[model samples]
Target: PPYTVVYFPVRGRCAALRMLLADQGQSWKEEVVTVETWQEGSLKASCLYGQLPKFQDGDLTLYQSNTILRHLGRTLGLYGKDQQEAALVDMVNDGVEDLRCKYVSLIYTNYEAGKDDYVKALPGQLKPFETLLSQNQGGKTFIVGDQISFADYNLLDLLLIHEVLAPGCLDAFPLLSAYVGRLSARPKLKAFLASPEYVNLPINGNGKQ
Candidate 1:
């Protein structure tokens, strides 16, 4: 089967994959689905759990976002080589997942009521990642040993989306702010983010504002 990527019409949670795929300069089809047409869509149908950003490749389909990232890392040399490095990358992804499902939900709820609890708790939410990155950065810029591994890009994607939507988020964590800047400034990801498709996707993460 050929490489065809299907994700939601909006680039909310799935922008990372698109950014990664684009950076590799790989040729693949991009399909975006809307709520009204999701059931009738190809991606939702192929996905086992009805999630967006499901990748279909050669008689196999994948659903979980982290798993897909690992597959890409292994096949395309994105994940680290040693078990320890891979574990570190997984930790970053899990951290992002925690923010996405737990913290983001709290923020969304607070936003609906005009409360700022989510933003208020952001510092606490960011502490662990900040400490981890600060120690990782000791001197080198990249996380997970170096050479810009998948862990770095994953964290970059998370920071890019969150920071763009929630300005001032990186204020408390100075080191993280610097790290995110460096990752976003990567040649591959920087260019992909500027591409017309991503530029065109509506930014729906305005709940905090």
Candidate 2:
């Protein structure tokens, strides 16, 4: 099956999906929408909900970043093996999205004033994932279960972007840092992380963070 991702030129919501694809040895085409093109408002209307990160799987098209990730997981067998594991994967992914949403607000809108408050509360927000890891095999493996699920890719992206927003943010959480390092070092994902394809993309559209 062929996968095509249409999203902003910057990483934005596409990073995790890209990592998942790369880690799974899946190839995808990047249909980047430049800032200039976005301003024209043509493609925006074409979007199902006026969002970037529209995805195509063969002849099927979909929108919503999380929806696309879940669909990929379903089609690609990254959702998890059993019902409990699948539910945990969903829980972990929802937590990642919650934190990522707050992080985005601080970075794009309130970095100057709210950053302190946001960063101050950051540890508490981060602790759930850390605690989730702590309880599961002492944080020795993937976030939800023994096997890598779509949530792992999503959580990895969240952690990586947070490090940019608040450097050494994971220093206080040894397990979380190790978890990041472990996932990032996987062979194909490691290469993708180092490759120009990922490194060269701006972390966000406005270059704020």
Candidate 3:
């Protein structure tokens, strides 16, 4: 494998890129960091930003999950078909990251106190993606364009985990519901989603969802 992922054992930020690798039929190594290991000072000290999800592609090392995604997108030709489409891809990914940050804060910090409000507000948070889908091929194809970009993988992971957080969250948005079904049905990605490597891990560190 030319690629390696060093991250905490939880799915967390690594899930999207892992899904992308699987769907692209690329093999990579997972260097799982247990909580105990993370608590030790060495690895944390070595991290440029004191973060997990340190990624390696051959000789190059990378930090930050989205940067790794974009790198893969560039190298694998998953960014988009053109400059305009690539900008849209980035836009969609930025939106997904915003929602994901909220989700992380809720799960880790204020889950019990904020879960209801978060769920109630989720539809509004998710609407932009639904609207993006509606504008693209009547929601028949990928999020930004006809071809799947790196952002689609990220957004798909976000949507799938939200479904776990709020079981029927996507029900009101027909396009999003179908989009989840459609993306989850991809042969390789579907297998990866079902495999123990993915399904067995806790979605978050604290086990809220």
Candidate 4:
């Protein structure tokens, strides 16, 4: 009854938001768009940005996955404790999106040709999260502060997907590896991840990556 999330059947952009909802123990409905329905052109034309992962909370219609994340985070009070922490949450989320964008580009475009190089440089790309962790709580807590934020969900999705891309990718960064383990073990989130609702969806539409 909280929000209605409309997205393609794939988990691409919506995975993190779904995780956030699930982690918060929030109840929401999913409106799955199939390729056949999408090709009909009505929904695409109605979309503000011609994208999936549109969200509806009361009279508000939210497009863009990150916008939905921020809105939900602010409403749910998982953003941060103060202005500085909120800014840090945004920064971490932006970094996650940057890497995620690259991953999407590769998966849909030149994955066969560029994947080797992508994996080779991925460690450097992931080092920032590890460094962020090291800077706060000596890698014992969430990315920005002691409490979990929207960015943690985003980063968790990013890390999980990357592990699928390159298994054991976090092994080089103990902090990151532990972060994944720590977050994934949260009771509600763990159950949601293991359930059929999440397990049934393909991570990407193309099923290539």
Candidate 5:
């Protein structure tokens, strides 16, 4: 591809695309920019919406992770077999994102008075996915109607990150916990995450330590 994706080496804001690209089997020039380089390149202003993970295709540049995912996943047939399946795949990924946000706050924030409550809230949040997977599996392994698509890996990565991060989250929902384990155990995800330089934290052992 002639396009270039410039991003910081740090995963804080833009790692999702990296994972998505890996899952979809798409490769573009990955320019790891330093913070100082960003200040010098001033690429933020070059973004159509001033966002990171900006795609510079030919002379055109676009931003936002999901936008890129849609374009690339569709072109690569990574979403699913048909429009309905693809749309549902995207929907499921968004739901995963919602859970990610909820749990990130649940663990990452200091809602001390509300900590236990928020921790309790985490189990309730698992219902959407557990029910979906159980009801939608349909004798197939993937979440959306059939074959495993990129969205499965997307959810797999983020959900495992959450399950491994959220305190007592796995204990709260062992089935879901095992599901994450099963999903993440796929050699693709395991190999992707276990790379020498890859970084992922376990949920309980550290206790946010």
Candidate 6:
């Protein structure tokens, strides 16, 4: 394996990258960290930012989820075709990250009390991606370009979890709904997403979507 992912048992930040790796047909290793092991402090002390999802590309180690995504994007040619498209890819990924942060806050901190409001606000949060897709090839292709970027993997994971969180949320957005359908059907990704390694893990650490 050329890559190694050190992370907790839950899907959390690792899902998108895992999807990317699977879709790209890249082999990797998962070094699962139990909560009990993480609480021991030695590994936490060794972490650059006291985080899970520390990644290794050969001998090079890295932290921060987006950084890992961008690195894989760069090395794997999933960023975009040109400078302009790359910028757009970054823009799309930034948008995904923004919404992901809010989602994390809700799931881990306010899920019980704030779920209704979060569901109510989800359409507004999700509309930007729909618009982005609509603007690109009349929603016929990938989010930023003709080919898939790393951001698409991230966005797909986000949308998939949201569908779990709020069924029928994408029913109103045809482009997004179709985009998810098309992307999820990719042969390798379809298998990976359905496999036990992916399906068996909780989406969030706190046991909420």
Tell me which residue pairs clash in candidate 4: none
**Per-model TM-score versus the true fold:** 0.85, 0.97, 0.99, 0.99, 0.74, 0.99
Model 2 agreement with the true structure over 143-198: per-residue lDDT tens digits: 98788899999999999988988899999999999999999999999999999989
3 or 5, greater by TM-score: 3
Off by over 4 Å in 3: none
**Residue pairs in clash, model 1:** 1-58
Backbone clashes in candidate 4 total 0
Candidate 6 runs further than 4 Å off: none
Whichever of 1 and 4 has more lDDT, that candidate is 4
- Expressed as tens digits, the lDDT of each residue in 1-209 for candidate 6 is 99999999989899999999999999999999999999999999999999878999988999999999999999999999999999999999999999999999999888889999999999999999999999999898899989999999999999999999999999999999999999999999999999999999999988777
The predictions' CA RMSDs to the true structure, in order, are 2.8, 1.0, 0.6, 0.7, 4.2, 0.6
lDDT at position 138, candidate 2: 95
lDDT of 6: 0.95
Residue 200 lDDT in model 1? 74
Per-residue lDDT of candidate 5, residues 120-188 (tens digit): 676677667767776775323776776766666656656656554454566655446666666557665
- Tens digits of per-residue lDDT for model 3 on 35-79? 899999899999999998899988899999999999999999999
lDDT of model 3 at position 162: 98
Model 5 poorest ten-residue lDDT run: 200-209
